[PDB]
Ligand SMILES: *[C@@H]1O[C@H](CO)[C@@H](O[C@@H]2O[C@H](CO)[C@@H](O[C@@H]3O[C@H](CO[C@H]4O[C@H](CO)[C@@H](O)[C@H](O)[C@@H]4O)[C@@H](O)[C@H](O[C@H]4O[C@H](CO)[C@@H](O)[C@H](O)[C@@H]4O)[C@@H]3O)[C@H](O)[C@H]2NC(C)=O)[C@H](O)[C@H]1NC(C)=O
């Protein structure tokens with residue numbers, strides 16, 4: 312589940328089943344690729360290091376749900392949010408509340424950095440070929456990559472990771488292509504064509 | 520006080536068909552085994568506006 316908020320506005324996030332008794336709900340902000348950081352306990356009591364921006368619902372209300380109020384949303388707050396529910400009426404939950412991804416909107420645009428790498432020489436004597444296109448710092452992660460044999464598309468061997476955000480608006484995607492030793496020398500020059508959001512950028516390489 | 524007591528209940532509603540068998544469970548909670556559960560939640564068959 313995803314929440315998209317304009318910059319500088321206030322976000323809200325919904326966690327868990329409806330309340331049954333007076334509760335004590337914990338709020339966690341897990342950033343992509345990192346560990347969960349404790350944000351709020353006692354339903355509104357935030358520890359050291361957390362600004363008074365983040366809020367919640369006091370666990371004194373029955374029938375309503377657990378709400379997280381992010382005031383003045385900033386870019387860093389892009390993360391997954393979990394919550395641990397302690398209802399006086401329901402047994403101790405060991406399955407954390409299901410996630411809710413915050414998405415600040417209009418970062419707005421990042422042009423990818425495509426870094427094409429030929430196979431390494433030690434790999435060449437080892438009888439294996441591999442092409443390493445490396446796409447960094449792009450937004451958003453909607454990149455689709457094709458490969459060209461001097462003028463012609465390549466069908467098989469194509470390997471490509473997923474656009475992966477990393478503690479920053481920047482994304483990341485690799486692109487490997489397994490090739491036979493005889494064909495890196497046979498063809499003229501190989502092409503990595505990375506397509507992002509509507510802009511295609513292509514990097515080629517030629518053998519020595 | 521007794522006379523007034525019965526006189527106040529003479530025109531009110533009699534529960535003579537409320538002796539139907541009941542099917543009960545303990546109440547909705549994280550039971551603390553010590554407390555037996557002071558209330559019970561029960562389904563039963565009741566007659567409607569039609570016999
Ligand atoms: C004492 O015991 C009685 C049993 O007779 C309890 O009464 C039942 O209470 C439960 C709640 O615990 C009721 O279950 C709920 O029913 C709601 C109504 O369902 C209608 O709508 C759905 C579609 O929306 C239809 O499928 C259905 O046929 C009905 O037409 C549902 O909306 C509820 O769903 C919610 O809870 C589930 C729990 O898993 C969630 O997954 C859902 O997403 C949703 O949030 C729920 O199913 C039941 O209907 C009651 N029955 C009667 C006869 O009253 C008392 O609650 C209980 N009281 C105490 C104090 O113990």
Ligand SMILES: *[C@@H]1O[C@H](CO)[C@@H](O[C@@H]2O[C@H](CO)[C@@H](O)[C@H](O)[C@H]2NC(C)=O)[C@H](O)[C@H]1NC(C)=O
Pocket residue numbers: 540541542562563564
């Ligand atoms: C209340 O009435 C229900 C029907 O509304 C009855 O359910 C019957 O239960 C018996 C088992 O005791 C089954 O053999 C029958 O098939 C059920 N349906 C009938 C008889 O139509 C039941 O008698 C009552 N249940 C209670 C009091 O919990």
Ligand SMILES: *[C@@H]1O[C@H](CO)[C@@H](O)[C@H](O)[C@H]1NC(C)=O
Pocket residue numbers: 544545550554555556
């Ligand atoms: C209800 O409470 C009694 C109290 O003695 C307990 O023994 C029993 O297990 C309970 N039944 C339930 C929770 O279904």
